[PDB]
Structure formats: structure tokens, C-alpha cells
């Protein structure tokens, strides 16, 4: 049965690719030659955030657009006040190998996880003054590689078990399981309407998952190496992904297509963290080569060089109001840029 | 910051920074050490010797007023490619090899080759621990499994002149031990660049002075790292 099944699956993927090619008629770059490029943007280090002992592996922005939480493997989740550079919280962890953090949209909770195999959710607004462990979600065989809140009582995680889990904070057990990835998933990003999310694994293929029904809605391929970073386009029907092959690229949900690849010859180290601006015109992408490039999402050109980090850039994210972008690197220093 | 609310927020941030300075003093005086191996290698008995689906089995042991951290990865899959760069600033990586199996020895050798040549794991020295030397000695003296059944190069092998055995021991056991050590040494010296070094050791589960060996190897590693940093090596 295996012999016929493999050939029929290969034929099915061939016909899927044939339909993909049929739907592909004119590329976005040649459509966007007519419109005027943004040109060159001078983004400067508006703020530098200091206090992390070891390198920073994750960061997230609040819906309030002011506070941001950053995780370091020295066992600290530092919640800052971005404008005043002040530290709002310094949460000590029970396992100092955190690579994930998710500031809740309501701001009440903060997630973390990593090699500890457990996603720790911490509450911030309590009768007593301290940030205690709200819950400890266990059930991932592999290391937690990304985590993102939906609301105060739900969170979606992507772990090293090549699987994602839709959790429930109240009960403490998994609600839905997302499987189908060969390699271990390293990052997921949520849609603005919070109905579907894109997760990128090391099988050089991202997947669009529906949170409610819990099945793999749409598989996207086209990368040569491990996918490290994922961000979802603000429109709600596209998303950018960044791999170790120093090339990031944009995919569209409805089109089911590999759009332009923001690749350049001088850059050879892969992308680690990727994000969009508020309008989606700009695409920021940190690199293993000390750099955080900014691409015009419709021109595929490096619209400005945004160096300033003395080590690997491992974190990124654009404030929900679009005012500024925070970049966390391995120099143990956050940097807020505008 | 002129407002009293902002002044008190800045003062709270200063208190948090003081706590972070205390944590920095604690963390900077502690040496981080990765522990790698395989099934039945002997990592578990080693980590219990100095003393669910959990991922990091943190261990802390103190030698000569120096704190060392064992980071054992458990209940995790193979293909240790994407979590291995987290241990980028660790003092060293202790690699545990069961030298008695002779059938998983090739897999352990390949794992050591992968770890030594890892692009992220450069600048990081490897402390090699060969375990179950009593079991290896019993197996080699019993003659149940010859070395040539798995390793054909044992025939054309000579014990090095600088190979000191235990005071009372069969020299075939010593030859096998030093051949197994020289395999990992050859892997380490094939492409080492003189920036990270391997420290093979012969030890058993009941050998209680494994923390002292880790201490000495880490002392040598940090000393050589500082000598290279100061251009003295």
C-alpha cells in the first residue's frame, strides 16, 4: 500500500504545484515598479535598554504600545517601560533557558518557555505586589520555540516536538494539537483577527493552521534552509518568513504563492527575527550577521541599513501603533528604533 | 520624571537594577557547563554522583568555592541542531561516552564529530568522559566481543608511550581504552583551529572524583581562553 500511496501523494503535490503555477501570472515586483519606492529611511537608536545579564532570545510588545517584555537565558523576563527606559518588572524564572515570551494583549499575563519543555504564564496584576507563576503548562516533548497569546485564557505554542498546541489557561491542559511538520517548528505568528496562525518549522516549509477546527489549512514551501522567523502581514491574508539561507520571502494565504524574495548578495547569514510595519510597506528582519535590515515589502530592495547591535540580532517587533521598532540581540541590550 | 509618580517609578526601576546586580554577581561567578551524551551512556549516574517530560535537568555542584551548572537535555528528540546554540557562552561541554558497548561507539563518535565541528559550538571546549571502564575491562577480558568485529583498525594499533595505566591492569584493556580515547582525539584534532580543546578522561560511575576533573578541565579551559584573549597562547 505504501508504494501506491507515496506515488499518489507525489502526484497530488504535483497537481497542487500545477494549480499554483496556473494561478501565477504576474509577479508583485513588476506590478510595483510603477509606484514610487520609499527610498532611504534614516532610523536611529532612540533608546537603549540595559539590564539583561546574558543574551536576549525573545521580546514582545504590548497592545498598550508602551510596555515590552524581553527574555534572557540568565533567567530573567524583564518588563520595561519603553519611553522612560524604566524596568516595570524583573521576573526570575525556574529554568534559565528561555527562548520565548509573549506579552498578553490585555497586559495581565506574560508567557515564557524554551528548553524547560514547559510554558510558564506569569500574572502581572495581583492583590499582592509580585509577579507569581500563574500557570505551568506541560505537555511539549520538544523545547518551546514560540508562544503567542490569543486572550487572557488561551495561548498557542510551537515547540521542538514538531508540533503546536492550542492551550487553555484555566484548565491547564492542551485544547488542540497542530501536527504535520517534519522539522521542529521555531516560530509562529498570529493573524490580527486571531483565527489562523502561521508557524515555520525546520522542514523549510511554513503552515497556516486554523485555531478552532485544528487542521493544517495551508502549507507553504519554497525555502532551502531552516525557517527561523515568521511574521504575519497586517492585512490578514499574507505573511513573511525568514530562513537560515539569508533570504526572507512573502507568502499569500488566498494566492497560496511564494511572492518576491528579499534577497541580497552581500548578506549571507540567515534571518533570525522578522516583522512588518503598521502599513505593511516595511519589512524588518534581523540577521545572524550583526544586522537588522529593512526591506521595502513591495520593491524587494534593502531600504536602509539599520545596524547598531554588537552581537547576533535574535529579537524584533514593531509597536502596535507603529511608532517604533524594538530590536533585541545577543549583546544583552534592547534597542528601540524610530 | 519631574512628577512624583515618575520619580517613584524610577526608584522602583533602581531597586530592580540593584536586584539585577545581585543576580549578575551570582551568575557571573557560576560557570555554565553543557552535558551531552546518549542512551545508556551514563549521564544520569554521573549527575546523581556529585549530588514527566522535563527538558533541562539542572544540576549545581560546588568545587573549591566554585559553582558549576550541569545542563542535561532530556525527554527531547534527536537532531540537536536548533537548541544547541543556546549554550554558546558555556564554559565547556562534557561529552559522555559508554566505551563498553562497541556497537553504539560509532554513533557516539559521530555525535562527538557533530558537536566538535558545530559552527555555534566553536570557542567552546569539550571535556570527554569515558564511562563504565569496569564493564569495558570485564568485556575485553571475557573475550565475548572482539574489537575487530566492529573496529578493524585495532589490529594495526600500538599503545602510545605516554599512556600510563592503572597500577594493576591487563595491558590489552589499556590498549583498548587508549584506542577509544585516540578515536575522539583524532576527531578533535582533525580540525580544531587551536581555539577549543578536548580533555578525554577515563572514569566510572562509582568514581567520585569527577567533579574535580571537571574543575581542573574548566580551569585549563578558562586559563587558555584568557591567554588567547591576552595573546599569550
Amino acid at each position, epitope marked *: 500500500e505504501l508504494d501506491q500511496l507515496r506515488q499518489e501523494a507525489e502526484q497530488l503535490k504535483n497537481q497542487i504545484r500545477d494549480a499554483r503555477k496556473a494561478c501565477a501570472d504576474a509577479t508583485l515586483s513588476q506590478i510595483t515598479n510603477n509606484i514610487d519606492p520609499v527610498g532611504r529611511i534614516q532610523m536611529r537608536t532612540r533608546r537603549t535598554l540595559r539590564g539583561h545579564l546574558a543574551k536576549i532570545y525573545a521580546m514582545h510588545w504590548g497592545t*498598550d504600545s*508602551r*510596555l515590552l517584555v524581553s527574555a534572557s537565558q540568565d533567567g530573567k523576563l524583564i518588563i520595561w*517601560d519603553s519611553y*522612560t527606559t*524604566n524596568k*516595570v*518588572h524583573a521576573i526570575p524564572l525556574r529554568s534559565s533557558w528561555v527562548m520565548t515570551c509573549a506579552y498578553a494583549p490585555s*497586559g495581565n499575563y506574560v508567557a515564557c518557555g524554551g528548553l524547560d519543555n514547559i510554558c510558564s504564564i506569569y500574572n502581572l*496584576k495581583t*492583590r*499582592e*505586589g*509580585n509577579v507569581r507563576v500563574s500557570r505551568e503548562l506541560a505537555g511539549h516533548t520538544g523545547y518551546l520555540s514560540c508562544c503567542r497569546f490569543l486572550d487572557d485564557n488561551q495561548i498557542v505554542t510551537s515547540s521542538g516536538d514538531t508540533t503546536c498546541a492550542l492551550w487553555d489557561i484555566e484548565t491547564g491542559q492542551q485544547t488542540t494539537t497542530f501536527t504535520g511538520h517534519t522539522g521542529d517548528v521555531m516560530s509562529l505568528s498570529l493573524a490580527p483577527d486571531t483565527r489562523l496562525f502561521v508557524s515555520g518549522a525546520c522542514d523549510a516549509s511554513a503552515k497556516l493552521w486554523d485555531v478552532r477546527e485544528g487542521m493544517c489549512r495551508q502549507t507553504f514551501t519554497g525555502h532551502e534552509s531552516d525557517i527561523n522567523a515568521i511574521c504575519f502581514f497586517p492585512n490578514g491574508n499574507a505573511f513573511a518568513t525568514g530562513s537560515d539561507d539569508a533570504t526572507c520571502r512573502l507568502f499569500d494565504l488566498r494566492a497560496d504563492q511564494e511572492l518576491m524574495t528579499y534577497s541580497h548578495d552581500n548578506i549571507i547569514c540567515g534571518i533570525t527575527s522578522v516583522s512588518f510595519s503598521k502599513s505593511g510597506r516595511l519589512l524588518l528582519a534581523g540577521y545572524d550577521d550583526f544586522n537588522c535590515n529593512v526591506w521595502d515589502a513591495l520593491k524587494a530592495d534593502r531600504a536602509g541599513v539599520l545596524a547598531g547591535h554588537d552581537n547576533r540580532v535574535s529579537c524584533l517587533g514593531v509597536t502596535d501603533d507603529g511608532m517604533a521598532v524594538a530590536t533585541g540581540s545577543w549583546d544583552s541590550f534592547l534597542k528601540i528604533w524610530n | 520624571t*519631574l*512628577s*512624583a*509618580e*515618575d*520619580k*517613584a*517609578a524610577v*526608584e*522602583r526601576s*533602581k*531597586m530592580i537594577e*540593584k536586584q539585577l546586580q545581585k543576580d549578575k554577581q551570582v551568575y557571573r561567578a557560576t560557570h555554565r557547563l553543557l552535558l551531552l551524551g546518549a542512551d545508556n551512556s551514563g549521564k544520569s549516574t554521573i549527575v546523581k554522583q556529585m549530588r514527566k517530560t522535563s527538558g533541562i535537568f539542572e544540576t549545581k555542584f560546588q568545587v573549591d568555592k566554585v559553582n558549576f551548572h550541569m545542563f542535561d537535555v532530556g525527554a527531547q528528540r534527536d537532531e540537536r541542531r536548533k537548541w544547541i546554540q543556546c549554550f554558546n557562552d558555556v564554559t565547556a561541554i562534557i561529552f559522555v561516552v559508554d566505551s563498553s558497548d562497541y556497537n553504539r561507539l560509532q554513533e557516539a563518535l559521530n555525535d562527538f564529530k557533530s558537536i566538535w565541528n558545530n559552527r555555534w559550538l566553536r570557542t567552546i571546549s569539550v571535556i570527554l568522559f569515558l564511562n563504565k571502564q569496569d564493564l569495558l575491562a570485564e568485556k575485553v577480558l571475557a573475550g565475548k566481543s572482539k574489537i575487530e568485529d566492529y573496529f578493524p583498525e585495532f589490529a594495526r594499533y600500538t599503545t602510545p608511550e605516554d599512556a600510563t595505566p592503572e597500577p594493576g591492569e591487563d595491558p590489552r584493556v589499556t590498549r583498548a581504552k587508549y584506542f577509544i580515547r585516540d578515536e575522539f582525539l583524532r576527531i578533535s584534532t582533525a580540525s580544531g583551529d587551536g581555539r577549543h580543546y578536548c580533555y578525554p578522561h577515563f572514569t566510572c560511575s562509582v568514581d567520585t572524583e569527577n567533579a574535580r576533573r571537571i574543575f581542573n578541565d574548566c580551569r585549563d579551559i578558562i586559563q587558555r581562553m584568557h591567554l588567547r584573549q591576552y595573546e599569550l597562547l
Partner: single-chain antibody, 233 residues
Framework: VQLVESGGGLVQPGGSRKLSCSASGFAFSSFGMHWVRQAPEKGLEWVAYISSGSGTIYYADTVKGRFTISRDDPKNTLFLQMTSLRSEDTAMYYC??????????????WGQGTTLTVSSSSDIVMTQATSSVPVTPGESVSISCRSSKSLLHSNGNTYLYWFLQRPGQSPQLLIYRMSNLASGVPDRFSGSGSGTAFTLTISRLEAEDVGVYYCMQHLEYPLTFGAGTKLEL
């Protein structure tokens, strides 16, 4: 979360006494604490403040060196050393917890209060327009507060606090900065002010709204209170 105070009693004028407030159920090492006091026939008044780590400590105009404040983090208590007790120093003192990070709610929970009976400009003079008004339940209730200086800061925060203590029990916290509503208080309360005059509205009134409503400024730091509008049913 219980703020139990101990002490009180009849004290001869000019004497010295230590008023204590024991804190349980919450770690206030990150809390700045206020010793707000209630005169027998007047409104609330603030005398002193000790920070979380005691780095910044401020007193009031009427009591600068005559009072002394201490906190014992291991013992989890506040100590108030008061000296030269005049006829004015009669009040049911309240120990007040207030964490001072962004988005916090200072003055949220207050101590039980112990009565103290004895025998025989830069200050923001902010006054409430009225002092007593009987209003029927259900329909909207408007309470007016006015300040002698603009309370809006350059950072976009206009500090304001409303308490509405129920008769014969410790004041609670209704609204802070007239834009954010506390967890314990129901959502029916609201506030609005330009920066000099402020108003508080209640959607529906019940037996819990009986009492006198208070008004605090925090831009400058005399911590001057309002006269207080007494709501009687």
C-alpha cells in the same frame, strides 16, 4: 491582604509613641507606604511616606522632624515614631499600600485604622466645591473637585485619586488618574477633568455609596486632600 495596625490609646501631650501597622498576605518590599491620618472632625491628611527600599522618604509640612517612619522588611511592619504630640495630633491613622510602577493603582488598599486620643505657597490648596448633598439612589450623581494648580503633566498623565470611604471603615480606592478604574470597585464609577476642575459620576447608587468622597492630587508632592463631599441617604 490585611493591614493590621496596633497601638493607640490615651497619650499625654508632648509624649512619644510608636504606631505600628502589621502587613500580611502581600510582600510590600516593592511597596511605598503612606501614613494617612483621619482627624476626628476633619478629613484625611497625609503626614509621611517611606519608599519600597526606603531610598526616598518625605514628610508633611506640619510634621517634619516630630514624626519618624520606619519599615522592617523581615518583620513586615511599619513603625511610626511620633514625638511632641500636640492637640492637633489626634487622628485614626491609616497605613496605606501603594506600588508605584506604570499602570499601578496606588492607595488601593488601606489599613484598618487605630484611633489616637491625646489630652490637653507651594502647597496645592485644592478645595471641593460642596461638602454635603443628599441624592436619591439610581440616577446619576455628580461630585465636583477643584485644584489650585493644573494637575496635567508633560508625560500625558493627570494624577487624581478618589476614595469614598464608607462610614466607620477604612477608605477604599475608586479611581486613579480619573481614567483608570480599580479592580475591586465596580465599573459604574467614572471621572473626568481638564486639569484644574474634576468631576466624578456614578451610573447607579445603592447602600454602598453612603459616605464622604475624597479627592487627592499627586503632581506636586504635598499630598493635600480635598474637603470631602458627604453623601447621605
Amino acid at each position: 491582604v490585611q493591614l493590621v495596625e496596633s497601638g493607640g490609646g490615651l497619650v499625654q501631650p508632648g509624649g512619644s509613641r510608636k504606631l505600628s501597622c502589621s502587613a500580611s498576605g502581600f510582600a510590600f518590599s516593592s511597596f511605598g507606604m503612606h501614613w494617612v491620618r483621619q482627624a476626628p472632625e476633619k478629613g484625611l491628611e497625609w503626614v509621611a511616606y517611606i519608599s519600597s527600599g526606603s531610598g526616598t522618604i518625605y514628610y508633611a509640612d506640619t510634621v517634619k522632624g516630630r514624626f519618624t517612619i520606619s519599615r522592617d522588611d523581615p518583620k513586615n511592619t511599619l513603625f511610626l515614631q511620633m514625638t511632641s504630640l500636640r492637640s492637633e495630633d489626634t487622628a485614626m491613622y491609616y497605613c496605606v499600600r501603594s506600588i508605584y510602577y506604570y499602570g499601578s493603582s496606588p492607595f488601593d488598599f488601606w489599613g484598618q485604622g487605630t484611633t489616637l486620643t491625646v489630652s490637653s505657597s507651594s502647597d496645592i490648596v485644592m478645595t471641593q466645591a460642596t461638602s454635603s448633598v443628599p441624592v436619591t439612589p439610581g440616577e446619576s450623581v455628580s461630585i465636583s473637585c477643584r485644584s489650585s494648580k493644573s494637575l496635567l503633566h508633560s508625560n500625558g498623565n493627570t494624577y487624581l485619586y478618589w476614595f469614598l470611604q464608607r462610614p466607620g471603615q477604612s477608605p477604599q480606592l475608586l479611581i486613579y488618574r480619573m481614567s483608570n478604574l480599580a479592580s475591586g470597585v465596580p465599573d459604574r464609577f467614572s471621572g473626568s477633568g481638564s486639569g484644574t476642575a474634576f468631576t466624578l459620576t456614578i451610573s447607579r447608587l445603592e447602600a454602598e455609596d453612603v459616605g464622604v468622597y475624597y479627592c487627592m492630587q499627586h503632581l506636586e508632592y504635598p499630598l493635600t486632600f480635598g474637603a470631602g463631599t458627604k453623601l447621605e441617604l
